[PDB]
Amino acid sequence: QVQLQQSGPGLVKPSQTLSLTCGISGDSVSSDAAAWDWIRQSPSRGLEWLGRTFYRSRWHHDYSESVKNRITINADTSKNQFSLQLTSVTPEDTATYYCARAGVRVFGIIVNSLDYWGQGTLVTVSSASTKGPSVFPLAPSSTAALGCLVKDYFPEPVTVSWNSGALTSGVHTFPAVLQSSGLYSLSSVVTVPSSSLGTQTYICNVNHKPSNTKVDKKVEPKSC
Amino acid sequence: AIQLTQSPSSLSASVGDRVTITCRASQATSSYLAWYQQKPGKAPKLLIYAASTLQSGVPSRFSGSGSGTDFTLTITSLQPEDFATYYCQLSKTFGPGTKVEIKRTVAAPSVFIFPPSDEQLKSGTASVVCLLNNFYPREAKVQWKVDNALQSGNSQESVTEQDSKDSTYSLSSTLTLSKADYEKHKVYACEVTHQGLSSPVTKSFNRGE
């Protein structure tokens, strides 16, 4: 596959500028068979195409009417990347932003279907401050369930692993909920054999990149 | 400028069912219709392009047809892994999506209750968590009772997306009280009503026990 690696901060204050980058491996950003798109997705508006850059005899730009006069998409040939800049953002621009490659060969031509996608960047438009989570154990009861409560952080997202990624079976990490404080909270749980509770260690690894927070919490039976 | 609609907007179908999803365009075009499949936490994945050409590696139970302004995606024998939202695309426009859920036999939740940690109580707040694990259908009734007094307005629920292997859901309900309010009561109970249970399941603890 062509690999698309997204980077850039998610949190943008109202009226300021969203800036994201998409690094390309396995194709050249200048290829005359490719086009490079930005797409965003939100619960309200679904999937929306934002714009496109591509090189033929020169560089071309095509942008959506929905972001008229606010969008710039530039390619960097030396770094083999392309970028998105969206100015004067409002809460309507809160969304998950994807880069993508347009172009599939069929019928001896190229149709502009999106064969490869970046991983997505959640972009939150808000004036509020970043805050890292507190992490609390959900201790197994004295066949068994245990977990971590990941409470009071902003903005989304957090990632949770178990035993540094070794433990995946039986894990459920719930979608976060926005509390009345304006801070998010979620829990991550896992079911494990009851017989393991004394001898197998269980540690949840919580990463909240916007606050540079990394927390490991060991989850063990409550003593007394 | 073209606009796309999709029908149905959502559906629930059993494993092995033939599933048909339609995409309608507001006008004819020179562009070629593509179908995408999007699973939770992931980018959309291209399944079909040029209306009927299957992307390499996609199972042959997926097929696309149609012409003019009316197009169809057919799944000949729905599988658990086919839980997803399916989107059509024409020129630069995406359809609104069709959410496909797998209908399976009833599965009762396994229920667990967690008291607040001592660490959190020092901070002045108490979170009590009730977990409903691996159940179907998604609908469930969770009631918090504190000293047998029904709670209202102090809890929040969250539900996982349908599991791609066993087609179940899990759910958390979190009761939040101040440390002071938590300390004025003894019996904390989560009572679960669900189609898979012939009578409600209650899990409880006594604060300090």
Residue numbers in the entry:
A (entry chain A): 1 to 35, 35A, 35B, 36 to 52, 52A, 52B, 53 to 82, 82A, ...
B (entry chain B): 1 to 91, 96 to 213
Q: What text does the study give?
A:
The VH6-1 class of antibodies includes some of the broadest and most potent antibodies that neutralize influenza A virus. Here, we elicit and isolate anti-idiotype antibodies against germline versions of VH6-1 antibodies, use these to sort human leukocytes, and isolate a new VH6-1-class member, antibody L5A7, which potently neutralized diverse group 1 and group 2 influenza A strains. While its heavy chain derived from the canonical IGHV6-1 heavy chain gene used by the class, L5A7 utilized a light chain gene, IGKV1-9, which had not been previously observed in other VH6-1-class antibodies. Antibodies of this class show characteristic immunoglobulin sequence features, such as the use of the IGHV6-1 gene and the presence of an “FG” motif in the third heavy chain-complementary determining region (CDR H3).
